[PDB]
């Protein structure tokens, strides 16, 4: 008899912070200390096994400075002699779309303006524009950091004394960020 449990299954962590992933096992079942080994295997060597925790019945893996590419599902595995078990752990890395750069371009001869919002973050954001009657065009690329750069462009005749807000929705994080553009 031998099983592994996971006290916490989903770890939501910000880029740049630390995380310690854990799965546990009952040392009254796995009595033989010499035959204990543990591994964290991504479903697809950043996490360090804290092996002094194994005699305590804990497989603990530390990532001291989290990156976007640490996100995903992992199998937290313990072998106890000639038996083994595992649990799935999910790391959800967040890089908030907190810095939203804005741009205003006047279009000659139309009385219209082209408004841009651009921000980087993770996972992919969708962009809406508040209380406007014209559709926006939004695109993205991925950066080498694994962030998405999301760019949204709206062209309209600004109703005099109106501001315009672009909203970034980061669904996995249930996060909204926004910028307000004053075309004056």
């Amino acid at each position: 008899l031998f099983t592994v449990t996971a006290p916490k299954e989903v770890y939501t962590v910000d880029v740049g912070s630390s995380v310690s992933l854990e799965c546990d096992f009952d040392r009254r079942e796995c009595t033989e200390l010499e035959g204990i080994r543990a591994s964290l295997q991504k479903v697809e060597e950043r996490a360090t096994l804290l092996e002094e925790q194994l005699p305590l019945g804990k497989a603990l893996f530390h990532i001291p400075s989290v990156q976007v590419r640490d996100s995903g599902q992992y199998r937290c595995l313990v072998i106890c002699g000639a038996a083994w078990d595992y649990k799935y752990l999910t790391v959800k890395v967040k890089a908030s779309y907190m810095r939203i750069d804005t741009r205003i371009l006047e279009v000659p001869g139309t009385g219209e303006v082209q408004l841009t919002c651009q921000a980087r973050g993770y996972p992919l954001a969708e962009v809406s524009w508040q209380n406007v009657s014209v559709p926006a065009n939004t695109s993205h690329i991925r950066t080498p950091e694994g962030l998405y750069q999301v760019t949204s462009v709206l062209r309209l005749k600004p109703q005099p004394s109106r501001n315009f807000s672009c909203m970034f929705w980061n669904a996995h994080m249930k996060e909204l960020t926004s910028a307000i553009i004053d075309p004056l």
């Binding site: 008899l1 031998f2 099983t3 592994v4 996971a6 299954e9 080994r37 295997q41 199998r75 595995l77 072998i79 000639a82 038996a83 083994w84 078990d85 595992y86 649990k87 799935y88």
Partner: protein, 112 residues
């Protein structure tokens, strides 16, 4: 690699159910587990086959038999109940240092 067949299996309550876990290359150093996905989609160990012996985790109805072709295994549930219905999979790892887990696709049991 591992397969786990049939991908969809239906039996009447009280009948035995048998899945086959087929390994591309079984060897004596492997430990073979039979798992179920829980109501939270977490893997939960049902039984293991290691050193030629099947050991159930919490229900002795679950047993693993190595076939004469060595590389295939029957995962048998004796005397099925409605609540045995669900998604199961098999998984293997070597006892050798640095070994990687391999998992089969899931297979669904429906008990009627």
């Amino acid at each position: 690699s591992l397969t786990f067949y049939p991908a969809w299996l239906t039996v009447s309550e009280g009948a035995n159910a048998t899945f086959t876990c087929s390994l591309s290359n079984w060897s004596e150093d492997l430990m073979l587990n039979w798992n179920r996905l829980s109501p939270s989609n977490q893997t939960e160990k049902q039984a293991a086959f290691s050193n030629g012996l099947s050991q159930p985790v919490q229900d002795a109805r679950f047993q693993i038999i190595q076939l004469p072709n060595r590389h295939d295994f029957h995962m048998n549930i004796l005397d099925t109940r409605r609540n045995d219905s669900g998604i199961y999979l098999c998984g293997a790892i070597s006892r050798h240092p640095k070994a990687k887990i391999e998992e089969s696709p899931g297979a669904e049991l429906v008990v009627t």
